[PDB]
Amino acid sequence: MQLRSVIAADHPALFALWSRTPGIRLRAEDAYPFFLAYLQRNPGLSLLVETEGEVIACLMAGHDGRRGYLQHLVVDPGYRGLGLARRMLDEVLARLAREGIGKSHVFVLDAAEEAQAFWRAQSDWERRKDIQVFSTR
Amino acid sequence: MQLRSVIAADHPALFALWSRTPGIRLRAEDAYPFFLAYLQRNPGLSLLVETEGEVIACLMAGHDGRRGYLQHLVVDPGYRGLGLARRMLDEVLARLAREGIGKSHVFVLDAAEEAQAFWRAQSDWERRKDIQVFSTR
Ligand SMILES: CC(=O)SCCNC(=O)CCNC(=O)[C@H](O)C(C)(C)COP(=O)(O)OP(=O)(O)OC[C@H]1O[C@@H](n2cnc3c(N)ncnc32)[C@H](O)[C@@H]1OP(=O)(O)O
Ligand SMILES: CC(=O)SCCNC(=O)CCNC(=O)[C@H](O)C(C)(C)COP(=O)(O)OP(=O)(O)OC[C@H]1O[C@@H](n2cnc3c(N)ncnc32)[C@H](O)[C@@H]1OP(=O)(O)O
């Protein structure tokens, strides 16, 4: 079970993982050119776990020079409950802290009941009830 | 009324503007080293307006390779209602779009009644009622 940085050549394996994971919504930004630019901008910040040449978990992460933003946290069903998500999260947050990023955010759809439950259970995170988000249309 | 890119040398003027503007909360990340690293990561994406050698308006912006994030939108009280915030917004969004960033976010405190009113009035933005935000503690 090798934890390592995601690189551009991982795109087919990660896109396949995302595609087969209920609860992960694929969008335009998940396609190769966006992935390539993301990794060039955020090198070493996104992580995956592989075993026997297969990718079994991932966490995409990056920052804007002020805050961290994490996306597409996945552990394959066969490898859940082993602490892999927590392992990736601890490592991403450490790397972000090295780069001067002391606060990070995740966005979770209200309709994603299982994801909400996961994030409410992480004691190092808090659901924000003090802010509104406005986004471009 | 000259609109231009913010550079590192603008820190004293911008910090002074932020400091004298009710509704702008100053934090650690507003100090010079964070500002310097932010501008290196996001060159030309933050803007200011100056007239007669004085900075009268600003908008800080950046991105993580996936989404845009804007903050510290300010127009000096003597120059409000002249479209300066809209001018900066249009230009930042255009520059973000050139960089492949098609969706941007702002976080606005629930208690910030005037800022909420401003953002609700921008027809190119929408208040999100479909997501929860979790942040590191
Ligand atoms: C990425 C976003 O911003 S939202 C999208 C989140 N991802 C998904 O919804 C994809 C589908 N789900 C998954 O891939 C997995 O269920 C994950 C990644 C959420 C969790 O994977 P796991 O292997 O359970 O995580 P891990 O074992 O590291 O969990 C850390 C702790 O969180 C807690 N936890 C995990 N899942 C849940 C849950 N659904 N509800 C409450 N608490 C949970 C557990 O206490 C766990 O400790 P453990 O190791 O003793 O079980
Ligand atoms: C940065 C964030 O994410 S939140 C923090 C926002 N910033 C602040 O609260 C700092 C204090 N406030 C300010 O500096 C200013 O009042 C600003 C920047 C919010 C607005 O400055 P203004 O000079 O009004 O900007 P501008 O004229 O470009 O406003 C655009 C339009 O928004 C609307 N608008 C502006 N302020 C408000 C308001 N308080 N309520 C409702 N609508 C408004 C108007 O329709 C205005 O039309 P106009 O372009 O014809 O003038």
Cross-chain residue pair B38–A66, CB shorter than 8 Å? yes
How many domains does chain A divide into?
1
Instruction: Output the six-digit token pair for A72.
Output: 């597409």
By CB neighbour count within 10 A (0-12 exposed, 13-18 middle, 19+ buried), where does A20 fall?
exposed
Instruction: Output the six-digit token pair for A70.
Output: 């994490």
How large is the greatest C-alpha to C-alpha distance in chain A, in angstroms? 45
Domain residues for B101?
Answer: 1-137
**Closest Cα in chain A, distance from residue B8 (Å):** 14
Question: DSSP strand E in chain A: where?
Answer: 2-5, 47-51, 54-63, 68-75, 104-109, 125-127, 131-136
Which CATH number covers residue B16?
A: 3.40.630.30
Method: X-ray
Q: Please indicate if any CB of chain B lies within 8 Å of the CB of A111.
A: yes
How large is the greatest C-alpha to C-alpha distance in chain B, in angstroms? 45
- Ligand 2 centroid to residue B62 C-alpha, Å: 20
Return the DSSP state at A89: H
User: Nearest CA to B125 among A133, A64, A67?
Assistant: A133
Q: Please indicate if any CB of chain B lies within 8 Å of the CB of A25.
A: no
